Amino acid sequence: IHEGPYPEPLVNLLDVVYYGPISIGTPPQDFQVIFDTGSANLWLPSSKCTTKYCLHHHRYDSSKSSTYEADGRNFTIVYGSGNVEGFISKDVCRIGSAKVSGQPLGEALVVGGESLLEAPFDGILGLAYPSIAVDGVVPVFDNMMKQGLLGEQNVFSVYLNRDPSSKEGGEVLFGGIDHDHYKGSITYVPVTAKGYWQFHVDGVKSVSASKSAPELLCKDGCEAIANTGTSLITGPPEEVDSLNQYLGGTKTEGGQYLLDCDKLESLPNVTFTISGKEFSLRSKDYVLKVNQQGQTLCVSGFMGLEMPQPLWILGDVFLGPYYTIFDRDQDRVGFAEVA
């Protein structure tokens, strides 16, 4: 869930964000969090919070934890329609069998309205670089590195299962790259700005069967991020307007576009070129069929989002067909075809 204010989108995809278990404190209190490469903060609902969001979620209670350490600096984070405010504490953070001691976390005293209200997760565990963390927070993965919990392979790898008939939603592997989730070879791209997992893209294109010219975007190259906490692909409004027009999409009304559910059958691939290799998304990958106000809507996986500097956010739509390696040893991002 990207930080910053922005328009309310038509469809709320919080239901389809990918999340997983962690525990905090001694003895462990359990939570579910988004593992979010688009942010660097860790936060959970506080037991001191009495907002509607907090009361419907699991809440961290410092007074039951023997490893809790006070801090109390205040923080704020904005997430479009919602914001999170509270204070920092420290405690043991358990991710699978790893034990991160002295991990800072935001105890959220207030959480944002209705946008975040339907979250099936309790909070967010950010996996980006420390430059985008709120003051007083060292990101979890940085602490894993500092404490030597990764056996000197300071990467993590992300596999997303989109098959809504499966049990598995995928995994995050800390300190490993699992070749049993990919085929072929990995294409690495260097990180261009250490904040987000941000890198250069060479071009974006689509070739329709029923159009006489291709759609060529990002023709001089562009910047992108790999963001596990965003469902859709977002890009500069004018480029995405153009792409969705090419595809036969109709805008309304949060930078999202709707496609005619009866005309999906010949939609073309949309191809991102990265480190000179083509990453081609199939319409079966990028069209989201959503039920909303008792309607059946075919939502384009590409939405417009105005950034301070223009940027493509390669969210779960992009990441699904790929196994992705986030490598802090070499400040690079790796992509391979998912197995």
TrEMBL record:
Keyword Acyltransferase: no
UniProt domain Peptidase A1: residue ranges: 18-336
PROSITE patterns: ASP_PROTEASE, PEPTIDASE_A1
Record carries keyword Hydrolase: yes
SUPFAM superfamilies given in the database record: Acid proteases
A single GO molecular function term of this UniProt record: aspartic-type endopeptidase activity
InterPro entries: Aspartic_peptidase_A1, Aspartic_peptidase_AS, PEPTIDASE_A1, Peptidase_aspartic_dom_sf
Entry GO terms, CC: lysosome
Gene3D superfamilies per UniProt: Acid Proteases (2.40.70.10)
GO biological process, alphabetically ordered: proteolysis
Active site: D36, N227
Protein keywords: Aspartyl protease, Disulfide bond, Hydrolase, Protease, Signal
Disulfide bonds: C49-C54, C218-C222, C261-C298
Family membership: Belongs to the peptidase A1 family.
PANTHER family: BETA-SITE APP-CLEAVING ENZYME, ISOFORM A-RELATED
Protein's name in the database: Putative cathepsin d
